């Protein structure tokens, strides 16, 4: 299923880049070579100014630096929050969970902070 969608995307991409390859004057063999390599690669403190009186008031910032864990990239239509919970109308997008990819149109989410 997902591989079939990928093949359709390949067809769309090549068709969309043909015109640019003609505009820039480059030969068409580049597209064939690109597709071949792409497929192969895929498969009392009165003086309060000092703030040092408190320490370890944060968390590890390395999660955003790593980004190695599963990542979901999509578009959002509505996102509401009522004092505890975050609600998500995320529309069509892509998800990368455990390497395997997932495709969706409507995504509904509820989370707690």
């Amino acid at each position: 299923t997902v591989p079939k969608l990928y093949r359709s995307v390949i067809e769309d991409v090549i068709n969309d880049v043909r015109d640019i390859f003609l505009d820039d004057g480059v030969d068409e063999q580049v597209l064939m070579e690109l597709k071949t390599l792409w497929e192969n690669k895929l498969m009392g403190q009165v003086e309060e100014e000092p703030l040092n009186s408190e320490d370890d008031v944060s968390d590890e910032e390395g999660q955003e630096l790593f980004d190695t864990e599963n990542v979901v990239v999509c578009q959002y239509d509505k996102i509401h929050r009522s004092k505890n919970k975050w609600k998500f109308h995320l529309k069509d997008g892509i998800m990368n969970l455990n390497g395997r990819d997932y495709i969706f149109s409507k995504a509904i989410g509820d989370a707690e902070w």
Partner: protein, 56 residues
């Protein structure tokens, strides 16, 4: 390379032979006007890509 120069002269006629139709007649002008509109949105649309790559 000499043949590429000849092809460039032919691309100029595409527009230049067309240019004679302009003044005598506006589709090309409309297309040009549309192109500018695409560029305006692009820059805004593009801004998101650089920051999203930094975010993820």
């Amino acid at each position: 390379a000499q043949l590429k120069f000849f092809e460039q002269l032919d691309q100029i006629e595409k527009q230049r032979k067309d240019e004679q139709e302009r003044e005598i007649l506006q589709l090309r002008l409309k297309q040009k006007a549309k192109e500018m509109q695409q560029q305006e949105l692009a820059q805004m649309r593009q801004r998101d890509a650089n920051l999203t790559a930094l975010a993820a």
